[PDB]
Design a protein around this nucleic acid. Structure first.
Length: 65
DNA sequence: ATGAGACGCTGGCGATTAGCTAATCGCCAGCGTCTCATCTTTATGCGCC
């Protein structure tokens, strides 16, 4: 129904899909790339505020007694 | 040694037939961001030919 279904499908599955669909996904990504405001790369960690915030509190507690 | 010259309802209707700018007012107008640097310039504050 959307392009993101094909996106998620091609991202997860490692099966040989049609070349036109692969082209559509890649060209759609290029046509709407995103901002370059954040330097480096954000590898998908916990992806939740809770876990990383707990880690933050852990670092703050071990840093300052 | 005879046989030409002298020429109409229109105007006033209807009724087709055909064709055209203009005056009044309302609507409604591509726009969204960020980064980066870059220079200026201003308010105040300090010096005598």
């Amino acid at each position: 129904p959307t392009i993101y279904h094909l996106r998620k499908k091609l991202v997860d599955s490692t099966d040989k899909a049609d070349l036109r669909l692969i082209y559509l996904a890649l060209a759609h990504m290029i046509k709407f790339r995103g901002h370059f405001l954040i330097e480096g790369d954000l590898n998908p960690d916990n992806s939740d505020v809770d876990k990383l915030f707990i880690q933050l509190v852990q670092t703050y507690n071990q840093l300052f007694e």
